[PDB]
Design a protein around this ligand. Sequence first.
Ligand SMILES: *[C@H](O)[C@H](C[C@@H]1CCNC1=O)NC(=O)[C@H](CC(C)C)NC(=O)OC[C@H]1CC(=O)N(C[C@@H]2C[C@@H]3C=C[C@H]2C3)C1
Ligand SMILES: *[C@H](O)[C@H](C[C@@H]1CCNC1=O)NC(=O)[C@H](CC(C)C)NC(=O)OC[C@H]1CC(=O)N(C[C@@H]2C[C@@H]3C=C[C@H]2C3)C1
Lengths: 305, 305
Amino acid sequence: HHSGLVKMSHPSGDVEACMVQVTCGSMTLNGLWLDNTVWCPRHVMCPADQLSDPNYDALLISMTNHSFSVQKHIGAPANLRVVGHAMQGTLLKLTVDVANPSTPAYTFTTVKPGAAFSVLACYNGRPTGTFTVVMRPNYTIKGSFLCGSCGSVGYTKEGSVINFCYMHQMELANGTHTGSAFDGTMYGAFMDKQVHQVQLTDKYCSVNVVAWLYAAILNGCAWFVKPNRTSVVSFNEWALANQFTEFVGTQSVDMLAVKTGVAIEQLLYAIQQLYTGFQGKQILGSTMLEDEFTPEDVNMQIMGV
Amino acid sequence: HHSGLVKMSHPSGDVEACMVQVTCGSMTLNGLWLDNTVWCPRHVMCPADQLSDPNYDALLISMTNHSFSVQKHIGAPANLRVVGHAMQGTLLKLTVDVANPSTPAYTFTTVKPGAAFSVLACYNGRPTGTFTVVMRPNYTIKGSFLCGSCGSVGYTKEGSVINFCYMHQMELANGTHTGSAFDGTMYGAFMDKQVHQVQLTDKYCSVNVVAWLYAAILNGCAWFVKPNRTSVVSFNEWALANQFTEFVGTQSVDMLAVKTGVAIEQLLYAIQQLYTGFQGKQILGSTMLEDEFTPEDVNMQIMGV
Ligand SMILES: *[C@H](O)[C@H](C[C@@H]1CCNC1=O)NC(=O)[C@H](CC(C)C)NC(=O)OC[C@H]1CC(=O)N(C[C@@H]2C[C@@H]3C=C[C@H]2C3)C1
Ligand SMILES: *[C@H](O)[C@H](C[C@@H]1CCNC1=O)NC(=O)[C@H](CC(C)C)NC(=O)OC[C@H]1CC(=O)N(C[C@@H]2C[C@@H]3C=C[C@H]2C3)C1
């Protein structure tokens, strides 16, 4: 049996039309062209052989507008003249003299741990792939990024409005990734430097595990459901000692409880038992808990909400 | 540790610009507009209450050109006048009086079991999501499709050329999906009818399992590698008795063997042992074999080829 769940990304066309290549000195990466502004990671200013631990304030002072070259490649090829530049946090804000005629309706938002978003991976200003990730509790993502991918963007969509939430910056030693929000802050405690940094400990996202167990029930797989219940308060105390996030319910989870007739508290109890072992049984083809699907994923993909 | 593998789809913009809505009678679904042709599933001709087991030859005779309404919604809204119609296998070929000005360079191809492709899921001629799947050995895909999704398309890309390989038709009782190639044939032994159909038995895709074990080695995870080797001939005999596809090597797998220094035959032996059980150990976070990543995925995402 197949659960009917896949890793679903938004269609990428609207964002593809905003990607550009930004070159400065010996560095080239990707940027996002919206209206008369191009956003890109500030380490484009760094000499390619001094990425270890840069002094970005001094680099910024050394640049002028024609220190930067902005090129759009696909769709409508163009060189975009830079007429202003500024730094906000770990991003550069370049002002260009042409407004992107394909600028979508958009906002900037910050994504929260456990929430999903779509990524458009780009190299040299050319989109190459798209994938979806959940923001981990330790403010990394389990992505797929190589050299040249910085400036690739992550986003969600509400209606036709694109909510940009992530601009790629770096890989960590354990193979995970992190980046900036468009307010210029890095997610988590990370800084845009290549030297050793403490990494926070990851955790299972409890609300997503609950969503996945509801997905199992909706597929006729409920062997783990018992009358036994664990309160949210009691579960959250247990979670703190067992590398789980605390559970915070939402309307999306409530809709799953109503559809299946299985209470949240029954699945909180199930999680505590399953964490100790599946005892040879599988759930939706798996012998470990799955936290990479959201309640919204389950509502949309299975219940067609 | 994260392997650096995600489910990677192609950027969807070029295909989004080809999607249209096709209406006929009481049915509406999606179609693909290339040049002066619109492709769509033939069951658009079926009255919505007679999808059980249609006589499509009789339905086709009963239609005329203005039995069909073709509408493009996003980007460049339009009603496309139908000036011809024909049936090929399980698809309709509608001729319209306007050439799609956004027609990409394209081909039609058939995808083979174990190979990956990208899907653009659409409803009412509007793209809603994108995801990637491997064609299963029993000629189903483990997708995410709801009512209204037929006519959604699957494709691969070589350079800028889009190779269309799949047009969605139906869901099976076990939750998997299947569809047509653009020559009009259904994948596998399936027919575009809603009544009971024998489903062929699925299998592990051995070449993809080998790719995944190489991905593990490339991430420093090689506890399952031993000097022991199983020949391709011997493995393929074993596979026939154990619900594995026969292994057929490719240049992409050879590149992984060269990079890691681990021979294909060492991993064929490992698979035979792992199939019997992982004995409490994990590989790239998993306690079962993974066959949803291709050798090309591993080369591109990890080795940057
Ligand atoms: C931007 O294109 C690029 C994206 C990277 C390339 C590889 N995959 C990606 O996602 N970003 C960088 O190269 C970035 C630049 C700095 C922020 C200025 N640096 C980066 O990602 O470094 C790669 C890491 C690999 C690794 O193990 N570390 C951790 C270091 C090594 C040593 C142990 C811990 C610290 C010190 C750096
Ligand atoms: C086209 O939009 C649509 C896509 C479907 C809807 C649900 N998810 C999808 O992928 N295709 C159809 O509705 C399709 C139409 C026929 C090909 C004319 N029929 C279809 O997909 O039927 C849904 C299946 C669910 C199910 O269990 N079966 C198997 C039947 C039921 C009974 C046991 C086995 C046979 C007889 C049909």
